[PDB]
Amino acid sequence: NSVFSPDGRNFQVEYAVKAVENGTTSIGIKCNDGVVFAVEKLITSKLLVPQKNVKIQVVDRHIGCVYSGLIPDGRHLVNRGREEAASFKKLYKTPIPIPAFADRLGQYVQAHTLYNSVRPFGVSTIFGGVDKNGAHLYMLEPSGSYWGYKGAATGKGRQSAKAELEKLVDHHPEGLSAREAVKQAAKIIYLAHEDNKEKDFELEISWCSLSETNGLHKFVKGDLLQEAIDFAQKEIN
Amino acid sequence: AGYDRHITIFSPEGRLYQVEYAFKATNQTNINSLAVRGKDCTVVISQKKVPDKLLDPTTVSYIFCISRTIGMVVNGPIPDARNAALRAKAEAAEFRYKYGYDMPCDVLAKRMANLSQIYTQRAYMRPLGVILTFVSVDEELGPSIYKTDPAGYYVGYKATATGPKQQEITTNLENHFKKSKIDHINEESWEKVVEFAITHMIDALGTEFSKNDLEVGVATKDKFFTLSAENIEERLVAIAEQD
Amino acid sequence: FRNNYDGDTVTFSPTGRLFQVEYALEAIKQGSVTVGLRSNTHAVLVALKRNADELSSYQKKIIKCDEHMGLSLAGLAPDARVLSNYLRQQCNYSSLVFNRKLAVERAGHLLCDKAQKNTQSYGGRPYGVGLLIIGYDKSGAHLLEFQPSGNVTELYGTAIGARSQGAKTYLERTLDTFIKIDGNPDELIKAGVEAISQSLRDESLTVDNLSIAIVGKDTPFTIYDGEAVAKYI
Amino acid sequence: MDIILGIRVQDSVILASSKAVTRGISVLKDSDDKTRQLSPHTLMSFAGEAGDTVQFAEYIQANIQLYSIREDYELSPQAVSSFVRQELAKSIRSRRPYQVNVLIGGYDKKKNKPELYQIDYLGTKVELPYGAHGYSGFYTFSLLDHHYRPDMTTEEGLDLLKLCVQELEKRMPMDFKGVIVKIVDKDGIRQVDDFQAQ
Amino acid sequence: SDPSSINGGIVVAMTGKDCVAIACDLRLGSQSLGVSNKFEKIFHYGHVFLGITGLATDVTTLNEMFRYKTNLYKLKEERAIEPETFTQLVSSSLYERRFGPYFVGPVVAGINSKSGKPFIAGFDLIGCIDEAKDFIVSGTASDQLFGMCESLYEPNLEPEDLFETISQALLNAADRDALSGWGAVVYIIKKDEVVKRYLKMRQD
Amino acid sequence: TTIVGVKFNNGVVIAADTRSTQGPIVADKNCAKLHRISPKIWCAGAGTAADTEAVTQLIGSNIELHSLYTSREPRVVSALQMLKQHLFKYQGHIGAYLIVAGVDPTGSHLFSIHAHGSTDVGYYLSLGSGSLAAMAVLESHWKQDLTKEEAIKLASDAIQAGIWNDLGSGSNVDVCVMEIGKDAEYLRNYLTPNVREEKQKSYKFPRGTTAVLKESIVNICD
Amino acid sequence: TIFSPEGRLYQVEYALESISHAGTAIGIMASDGIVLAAERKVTSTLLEQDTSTEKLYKLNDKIAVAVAGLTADAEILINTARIHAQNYLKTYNEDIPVEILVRRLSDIKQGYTQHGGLRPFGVSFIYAGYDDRYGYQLYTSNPSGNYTGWKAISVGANTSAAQTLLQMDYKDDMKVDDAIELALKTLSKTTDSSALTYDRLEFATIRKGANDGEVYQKIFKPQEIKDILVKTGIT
Amino acid sequence: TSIMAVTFKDGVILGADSRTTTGAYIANRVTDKLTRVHDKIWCCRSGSAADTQAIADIVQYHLELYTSQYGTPSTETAASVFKELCYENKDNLTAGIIVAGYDDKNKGEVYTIPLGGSVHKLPYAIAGSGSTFIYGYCDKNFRENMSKEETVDFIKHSLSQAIKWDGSSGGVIRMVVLTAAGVERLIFYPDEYEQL
Amino acid sequence: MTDRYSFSLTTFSPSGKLGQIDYALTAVKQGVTSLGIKATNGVVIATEKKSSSPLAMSETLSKVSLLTPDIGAVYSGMGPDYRVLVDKSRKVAHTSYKRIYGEYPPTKLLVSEVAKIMQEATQSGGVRPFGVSLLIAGHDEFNGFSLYQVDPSGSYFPWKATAIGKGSVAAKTFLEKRWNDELELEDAIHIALLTLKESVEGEFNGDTIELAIIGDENPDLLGYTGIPTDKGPRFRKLTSQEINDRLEAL
Ligand SMILES: [Mg+2]
Ligand SMILES: [Mg+2]
Ligand SMILES: [Mg+2]
Ligand SMILES: [Mg+2]
Ligand SMILES: [Mg+2]
Ligand SMILES: [Mg+2]
Predict the structure, then answer these.
(1) For B75, E129, F83, G201, which has the most beta carbons within 10 A of its beta carbon?
(2) In what order do the strands lie in the sheet with E19-25?
(3) Which strands make up the sheet holding D4-8, listed edge to edge?
(4) Domain coordinates of chain H in residue numbers?
(5) Do A76 and C151 touch (CB under 8 A)?
(6) Which CATH class for the I1-250 domain?
(7) Contact state of E143 with F25 under an 8 Å Cβ cutoff
């Protein structure tokens, strides 16, 4: 963990990434006024209750988080994010800006790569929301590295998702609506499922849009969820 | 795998391998940077590389605003870089609160070097794989460059450069300062000192830069600020005429 | 790959694996089988108890957590005591402070987070016990599966322990029938006792073998042992 | 209130301590021995606040007994008294101070002299030919200023003590039920069992 | 009542030609009741002299503290503490107990063995240094001591004369204080020798 | 105590009387109330004497260390910030009232500090029981852009106001001048207007006057 | 701190091994005094003899130690020992009895032997002291925390040799002047150098104080050693 | 003490008198009571000078840190930091603070934090011992969206009355103007404002 | 968060060696030569400013440091370890001495304090020894002039003259030949300059050499006047020019 290799690398962090790669694929898409998050839920058995193993987590009221890798580690990171967001709001009154929040997670994750007594986190987290000056999407690696994104993907299906995400940035250089990106998120998740086809899956979408959700994090459900599923099923063939 | 390569204890040769390895980490981003002093300014230039097209270019930076007056460019991985940024910021605020004046560039440098020295000596801390370049126009010392490494070493520079192709740029600058015989760049506007820096990076690395290939930080009397793509594009045009 | 990488819970393997956690998972498979399943009105726990000797008592597998919640254990038993104690406290806190019955889902989240901290601390060890948690709350009947890795999933039914794969295939088959056993406790218990049968290279299951627990709409979580389970064999 | 006298003659130190224990309106006991033997040749008498009085004596007694066994040696009266002063000096600035005044009577073997030490609760120490704590001093000090000689025998000192106790029985407003009288000399510590009507 | 008034006592120090003098009474009382005729209030550590007035438990405790500290000083420095240095040590030791002070009025007297210069100082209970070159007074008859010294004193007295002046100042200040007296002791200090004289005075 | 601090065109001056008292009694007829925080930053105190002397030495020592740590001359605002933060922490129980004055690389400074930890800036200040007498002089004669010579006069006059009219103050005037270019100059007993008149008589005693009970030589060595 | 299958403490044995390479120190106890002599580790002409003490240290007025091992470790222990003596003086108004001070130090050493996982102090001590219970006393202590009493003893290099020579010529009715002579003879015979010169020695006595009834610690100045090196006949 | 802050068309103006007393003695007749905690966030202090200086010093620290990590703080953020300190330490502080600031989004803002540690957002605010005499005058003469020169007049007249009646208030009248244009220090003298 | 090395990282090996101390000493051997020479009326400490780049400004890095007004230090080994030791020594001079006795520590006692800080890095859990050797030169009223060496083990020795680091063995020889007890300070500076010329590769001038003395008081360097019993610091770092003046008459 606190061990540099002779060529300056951190093998433990690199191994933690392998745990991420191993996980379900999750994505985030930035639109002209909000953000969309989507995740693939592997249906191990018919015994799992549909819609009832929620993977996407809210932090404060305006931030959504999705992650791929060791799920428990993601929860540990979100708990911390929530403490860090409550603390910020307590002192400064305003809810935490997204870059501010990103760094809070960033420093916390990095800290877990400094000491021999701890392991790095076994997740990559895609997160963001709407603040005082626009929409923000982030992705945070086990090393504590994070940058802003137009689109982001992690997990097993990350390569095909990135390919689809790269295509969207090229066809829509002037924006892309929240209502559109929700559809597109359903599509990209479906395409990325190609790799994990041996088992069935369930799609979870959530969004935080200035005009569509009033800058608050909301789960996509009902008619909007079904319509996106349709689009994905119809465009897969 | 012997202990003397895993923690910061001495090897029989008297070396600290974890420190040596931390110096290698500094280059893993493949970014070069350089700093020059003007007559009444200090300029840092660092390459900006945005390989992924999914990345938001605006959030990719290795230049930090530490205080109103001090700026810092980092050569190293971003997670360690941001760790050093945060602390320097915290240290800079605390100095002002306790001692009533703005933390000087060299003093913040010394302080951060002292923190680095500790990781050199205590077993449970790893060094940070970064090299910190601190710039400002000090109220007492004038334009200033001070640079700290994973060993806890720091010194002041007339000019300096850091990264994989560090040496090319160093020898370029060394050669210039032999001619001018002075230890700065004789120019009034920071605008022309930014130009000099960009020019001598181009020559030393043999590469042309667009507005998106660069990152500029400028420190003048009582402000340190970074240039936008457009402030840089204007600089690139200015050099193109004559050169 | 397996060599220098299972010393503690604080080391990743080059594959991305945490071996101490996978070894703690192996303590479950060693443990005696137990089954859980639910309809809309009730949730049921059925456990095969194991005796270490013919003169000994069959050791208990079902712990009550609140009037609306309880769990069955498979793996290291002392660990289940530690985890049910914490769960009893979380239930208690929720009643006393908020006058609210703790949601079964939150109980899941809480056990997950506790298990997790022991997959990242040096000098600690992961929990070596699997748990099946049943409850009736403000959204009806619930069943959970807890793994010492921290993974907690909500299911209609499941089984964990030795040879448990039999009962799990059975429930996966019987799904559509048992989910609808509403307003009939004794039929759902029957569907659970019949489910634990598919996991027996052992024998007949006697009146000491057997341990059943039920919770639902107008039934507080209760434990049936010995004499009181006779009518289900 | 409580009577605590000490007189140092030529070959011994004599301690006299009142026998009454009074709580409010009742004399609860009239045979109380306000003394702890610290070592074979060192005796300590005490007076003050109800509980702390015995608690302090027994604490000191434990410590000195520990020292004796550790070193297989008896501390000089001077060293014991210095220890005691330090404990009271510490106590005076503690959360709840010991409110105990003491006399330390000892026979030093290395020197072959008797020694008397007066120490109040503040940790004020002084070596004296004769001493007292509380009000008893206001009567006895003038008497001993007159009648005391440095060369007096143990028997002479007992007569002088008897003269002090008579004065206190005559002039003191409270009934202290007489004294228990103890002698400390080169042969150790012995109690005069007859003094009440001797 | 007042901790500095419980036991009583006085200390005075003066400087003369190539000498210093330090004097104290011998009383230890407990309010009105005189307890001890033999309570000396002056101590020394090498060639440095320290008198202390105030609560007697603190007088004793502080002597033991400064013995302790000067002893350790000598082992480390391989020389005896000098007047000026000791003064600084007394001061910081007192201020260290700022909100729980020793109820004392220390007085330091001595000759610097290197410079041959006579030195006296005084303190308040929290260690504020009184740096007079002529005389320092302390105790329950300090008012009376100030008056005596301010009249009787003159610079550069020869040891034998300084002895008379300091003895007279003490004796007569003591006799106007109900809490002071009962015997007196006077030290005359020269670079080479120190003479100690017990005075004859009213025993009331 | 009377302490004043006066600004002039190229620096700052501070002055004080030389009397310490234990209530009505005068203990030192010529003490020094002017203290050094660092070479060019000086200090005067009223209130608990031990407190002003200590807080001055503690902040003095820490300022020295700070200067060494930073390779810079100490600044008046640093002494100010540290003193005020320390005094505040102790909620007023460190009875230190100070006029701190000096020169540093940023110019010249004059500040007051009160025991509870509040500070103020000004061109002329006074503290102590002679405070009001001195302020009356300062308000009568202060003008903008005093010369060094004028500034010493005005400060010295203000201390005299306190020496003559306030019973808490007396004896001599000490002054410290801190000009921006130069070393600080400490003028001890700058004025001595209170010389004791020769006494009418000599009180030197005929030897043998005092009765001696016994005598012995005291041992110093080992 | 751990035990070996033999019932030995590795780190202690290795600390004692370290000590056997340090310069020899010798203590000899006579009826009217005590001698402490020790050899400085092969130095240089440029070492300041006058202001140096690497082997002989004063603990209080009546007790001293001769050191063998890590000097920096010794200074740690000496300093605490110095404090322990002053605590005792403050508590009892009597100078600490020699054994009590030795036991205390020995216990601090025993501590590092039994818990805390810190390296023991690489130090051996010879204590020379006087008190009014046992008169002149000589004690030894080592990194294990064991201590023993002696009439003559050595620590550091060649203790095997030095002890046999002392056993041979020591007799209970010796005066201090005879004990001085023995100590120097023994060092000279066990040295690993051409000659035992003054610049390589530290010497101290604890005598009955010239003429008094008091006890005096004489730490020999460089010149005084050169004098006593001729008197005894080694020049 | 007489202190006030007033929002107008272009931003916000802080005003204060210059007198500090201990009892009936004026310890300082030229105090600067207008305290900067950020470029364009200022405050006026009332109550214990020790307490409010220590508070102002900590807030300035918090906002400097804030600006290094997250940019420029809103006036609301500044007010929140003050309230946090004042509320959480109410049993050891006598501190009444008026916060006033400017940014391009929210324009001119005023917050008052009285003894208890409560926060109040207001069009204008008055505080200090001298303020009690101007409640009538201010309520009758304040309007929204006043011009700069009008606002300077409103403060000048208001504080002159406060100074006129309260012996604790007095000296010069200081002001700070806070607009997109920048920061402006105003000072008015007795010879002027007394004649109003 | 929290140390997992609560044990000594310096332990005894089967032969009695303390490995980490041994290795730290090797780190000192590789370090640039420094030296000290004691005269009758002063002490001189000198070293070479081995610059890491000609683009660095060598004045911004001082190898010679004032510890107290009458005490200075120079080192060989790891610079960063020196820097922090100097901070700790400056502080300990105040907290353990000046704040107690109102004066600055004498040289042997301050040296003793530094040695304790270094001994502790040799025994405490989770740390390595300091990779440096210091030379501490100072004056005090009662001990006169002194010079001390302090090693990574925490051991110190008083020296008439010594050299540490790279060419220490040759320089120690060169000093035994040249040194006597009648040397004035100017003579000692001259010997210091000569001794250092054998050790130095490139240019040998006042810009590449660092030299300080413990001389007499410089009342001019004090910063104030009017107190006659304060005469100023005896520590004084020689300037580039002052060094060059003594190389022309070399
Ligand atoms: Mg990815
Ligand atoms: Mg480390
Ligand atoms: Mg580590
Ligand atoms: Mg008095
Ligand atoms: Mg009298
Ligand atoms: Mg008014």
Answers:
(1) B75
(2) E135-139, E10-16, E19-25, E184-190, E194-199, F212-218
(3) D130-133, D4-8, D12-18, D179-185, D188-192
(4) 1-196
(5) no
(6) alpha beta
(7) yes
Q: Which residues of I are less than 8 Å from B121 in CB distance?
A: 81, 121, 127-128, 130
Longest distance between any two alpha carbons in chain H, whole Å: 49
H1-196 CATH, one of 3.30.565.10, 3.30.10.20, 3.30.420.10, 3.60.20.10: 3.60.20.10
Provide the 8-state DSSP code for G222. Answer: H
H1 is catalytic: yes
Q: A5 CA to chain I: closest CA distance, Å? A: 20
- Interface residue of F81, F88, F119, F121 to substitute, partner B, most B CBs within 10 Å: F81
SS3 for chain F is CCEEEEEECCEEEEEEECCEEECCEEEECCCCCEEEEECCEEEEEEECHHHHHHHHHHHHHHHHHHHHHHCCCCCHHHHHHHHHHHHHHCCCCCCEEEEEEEEECCEEEEEEECCCCCEEECCEEEECCCHHHHHHHHHHHCCCCCCHHHHHHHHHHHHHHHHHHCCCCCCCEEEEEEECCCCEEEEEEEECCCCCCCCCCCCCCCCCCCCEEEEEEECCCC
Count of CB atoms situated within 10 Å of the CB of G31: 13
Q: Does D122 touch chain E (CB under 8 A)?
A: yes
- E42: domain CATH number? 3.60.20.10
Find the distance separating the first CA and the last CA of chain B, reported in whole Å: 54
- Which domains are delineated in chain D? 1-198 (3.60.20.10)
* Domains and their CATH numbers in chain F: 1-222 (3.60.20.10)
Q: Where are the domains of chain A?
A: 1-237
Q: Distance between CA G119 and CA G116 in Å, rounded?
A: 9
Q: Which 8-state DSSP code applies to residue H11? A: E
Q: Tell me how far apart the alpha carbons of residues C163 and C31 are, in angstroms, rounded to a whole number.
A: 10
| C83 to chain A, closest Cα gap in Å | 17
Q: With respect to CATH, is domain B1-243 assigned 2.40.50.140?
A: no
A86 close to H (CB below 8 A): no
Task: Return the amino acid letter for A205.
Answer: I
Task: For E57, name the nearest residue in chain D, comparing CA atoms only.
Answer: D124
Resolution of the coordinates in A? 2.8
Question: How close I186 comes to chain F (CA, Å)?
Answer: 28
Q: Please state which CATH number belongs to domain A1-237.
A: 3.60.20.10
How was this one solved? X-ray
CB contact under 8 A, H79 and A99: no
CA of H165 to the centre of ligand 6 (A): 6
Which residues of I fall within a CB distance of 8 Å from F183?
Answer: 222-225
* Bridge partners, I48 (sequence order): I209
Q: What are the structural domains of chain G?
A: 1-235 (3.60.20.10)
Question: G118 vs I175: CB contact, 8 Å cut-off?
Answer: no
Break chain B into its structural domains and give their ranges: 1-243
Q: E130 C-alpha vs ligand 4 centroid, how far in Å?
A: 14
Q: Tally the domains of chain E.
A: 1
Number of structural domains in chain C: 1
- CB of H69 within 8 Å of any CB in chain A? yes
Give me the CATH number covering residue C193.
3.60.20.10
Q: How far apart are the CA of B55 and the centre of ligand 1, in A? A: 12
Q: What is the DSSP letter of B60?
A: -
